[PDB]
Design a protein around this ligand. Structure first.
Ligand code: HEC
Length: 104
């Protein structure tokens, strides 16, 4: 996917609620650094819903592809208030950006 496009998607659709940098602060949503290969609900010091805490999946390329299409379908009860990203290419660009930025 395209990291620069993915970065723009992130800035416009996610960055008001999320940071990605190491040590980034929690806002409405959790800091996302380290997300890849980690279970749901593991950002240190963030208070998740019980459903996000107990979803029990590992974040990676394919689970982010599904989740970001319709968060509340993937985790009913989530407090992430976000309709989703319908186009797979936008999702794939965004996820390429996250795999860089949350690992950098
Ligand atoms: C822009 C498309 C994004 C992307 C890529 C993500 N979010 Fe959010 N998010 C928000 C809140 C309140 C939560 C916690 C939800 C809960 O506890 O039920 C989340 C959670 C996530 C995750 C899961 C993180 C984990 O550690 O399991 C992920 C992968 C994620 N988000 C990605 C809040 C918001 C928003 C507030 C209005 C907005 C906009 C976004 N998030 C957008 C995005």
């Amino acid at each position: 996917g395209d990291v620069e496009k993915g970065k723009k998607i992130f800035i416009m659709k996610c960055s008001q609620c999320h940071t990605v940098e190491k040590g980034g602060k929690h806002k409405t949503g959790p800091n996302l650094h380290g997300l890849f290969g980690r279970k749901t609900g593991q950002a240190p010091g963030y208070s998740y819903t019980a459903v996000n805490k107990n979803k029990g999946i590992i974040w990676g390329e394919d689970t982010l592809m599904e989740y970001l299409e319709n968060p509340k379908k993937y985790i009913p009860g989530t407090k992430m208030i976000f309709v989703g990203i319908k186009k797979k290419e936008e999702r794939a660009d965004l996820i390429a950006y996250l795999k860089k930025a949350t690992n950098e």
